[PDB]
Amino acid sequence: PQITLWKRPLVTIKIGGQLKEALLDTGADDTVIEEMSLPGRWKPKMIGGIGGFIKVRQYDQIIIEIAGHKAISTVLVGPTPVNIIGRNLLTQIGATLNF
Amino acid sequence: PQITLWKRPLVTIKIGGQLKEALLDTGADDTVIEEMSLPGRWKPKMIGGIGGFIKVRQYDQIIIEIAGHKAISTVLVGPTPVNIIGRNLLTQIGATLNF
Numbered sequence: 001p002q003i004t005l006w007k008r009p010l011v012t013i014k015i016g017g018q019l020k021e022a023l024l025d026t027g028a029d030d031t032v033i034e035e036m037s038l039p040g041r042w043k044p045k046m047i048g049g050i051g052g053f054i055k056v057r058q059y060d061q062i063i064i065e066i067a068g069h070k071a072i073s074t075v076l077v078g079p080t081p082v083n084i085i086g087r088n089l090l091t092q093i094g095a096t097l098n099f
Numbered sequence: 100p101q102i103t104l105w106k107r108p109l110v111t112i113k114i115g116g117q118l119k120e121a122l123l124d125t126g127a128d129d130t131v132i133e134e135m136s137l138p139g140r141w142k143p144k145m146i147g148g149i150g151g152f153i154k155v156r157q158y159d160q161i162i163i164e165i166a167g168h169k170a171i172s173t174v175l176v177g178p179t180p181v182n183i184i185g186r187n188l189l190t191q192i193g194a195t196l197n198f
């Protein structure tokens with residue numbers, strides 16, 4: 001699709017076998033999902049936003065589907081106020097910002 | 100142009116007559132610029148991101164140029180880590196997210 005930006009560019013994702021809504025975020029380097037149970041090994045990380053930092057669980061090689069695109073990438077899980085799809089996955093689905 | 104997302108989507112902006120670099124951010128509702136001297140009336144506001152909220156100066160009806168595209172909009176100024184161009188201005192220059 002070509003997504004206009006009058007509202008938040010939200011898409012449906014599947015992660016850990018669960019359907020969720022997430023924000024396509026060109027300003028985010030990484031993909032960060034709200035606190036959930038996810039199976040697998042992980043390692044701690046801290047990531048920085050506009051209001052400071054949060055601690056997350058970094059999961060490598062996680063299967064995730066984004067607006068029907070089947071992907072495999074690193075997914076961070078932590079106390080983000082919104083599910084965020086960042087550049088690591090925007091690149092996998094071939095997204096571009098056009099003007 | 101059409102900007103891929105292998106790298107941060109950084110562009111040159113002009114604000115207050117001064118050239119700066121900024122991030123085109125579809126995940127940002129608003130536009131927030133690092134602390135700078137900008138003429139004009141303003142009022143305080145809070146904006147929230149990962150990590151919490153920050154207090155900024157809200158300037159209404161500010162002229163700004165984004166990668167050669169002029170626009171007039173609300174611009175926030177405060178202790179943001181990076182200059183961010185949000186949806187309020189992305190929509191004004193006709194930007195879309197495509198995949």
Ligand SMILES: CC(C)(C)NC(=O)[C@@H]1CN(Cc2cccnc2)CCN1C[C@@H](O)C[C@@H](Cc1ccccc1)C(=O)N[C@H]1c2ccccc2C[C@H]1O
Binds near residue numbers: 086126147
């Ligand atoms: C990987 C991670 C997600 C942590 N990235 C960010 O938070 C980066 C941080 N940098 C900075 C950075 C910090 C440290 C290291 N490298 C980079 C600045 C830009 N953000 C990207 C933003 O797009 C993220 C969104 C998330 C969000 C959306 C809706 C509601 C809550 C949170 C964001 O912060 N948006 C907020 C926002 C932003 C600007 C203006 C107004 C508003 C309101 C709101 O839309």
Ligand SMILES: [Cl-]
Binds near residue numbers: 035036037
């Ligand atoms: Cl859960």
